[PDB]
Amino acid sequence: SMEQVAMELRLTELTRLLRSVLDQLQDKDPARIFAQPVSLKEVPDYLDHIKHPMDFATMRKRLEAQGYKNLHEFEEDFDLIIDNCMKYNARDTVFYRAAVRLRDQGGVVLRQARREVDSIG
Ligand code: NA
């Protein structure tokens, strides 16, 4: 029907911005600590600690299937990447300290990304 593609149209301009955001957010992780999912072969107890694992590659797959219907859904999965790391890893570790820096530098990008989604509609 006409509305539906206008809606799918709207969804189709929500993902690329979110992608540009996902490109920019991942540029603040040059070490690639949060690129892939945490391995349950290398970390066998990881699902005792973390109930909802997330990473950039998993977000990318969901993005590629137009899974994010709004900026909030994208922001929840980006917060999971940070929040899971900072629980599992201790305060004196390169992992925790990479998640802190990604949050601080990522908040600059998500600020303007909200402004664009609201303005463009
Ligand atoms: Na902890």
Cα 96 to averaged position of ligand 1 atoms, centre (Å):
9
Question: How buried is 89 (Cβ within 10 angstroms: 0-12 exposed, 13-18 middle, 19+ buried)?
Answer: middle
- Please give the backbone phi and psi of residue 33, each rounded to the nearest 5 degrees, phi first: -70, -35
Resolution (A): 2.7
Dig out the tokens for 106 from the structure.
């990522």
Spell out the domain ranges in the chain: 1-121
Cα 85 to middle of ligand 1, angstroms: 8
CB atoms within 10 A of CB 61: 11
CA distance 89 to 97: 9
Ligand 1 midpoint to CA 98 (Å): 15
Helix boundaries (H) for 27-70? 46-49, 56-64
Under 8 Å between Cβ of 84 and 29: no
Give 97 Cα–ligand 1 centroid separation in angstroms: 13
Going from the Cα of 11 to the center of ligand 1, the distance in angstroms, rounded, reads: 37
Give the 3-state secondary structure of 105-116.
HHHHHHHHHHHH
CATH of 1-121, one of 1.20.920.10, 3.20.20.450, 3.90.25.10, 3.30.70.20: 1.20.920.10
Technique used by the depositors = X-ray
Residue 87 Cα to ligand 1 midpoint, Å, equals 4
What is the whole-number distance in angstroms between the Cα of residue 55 and the centre of ligand 1? 18
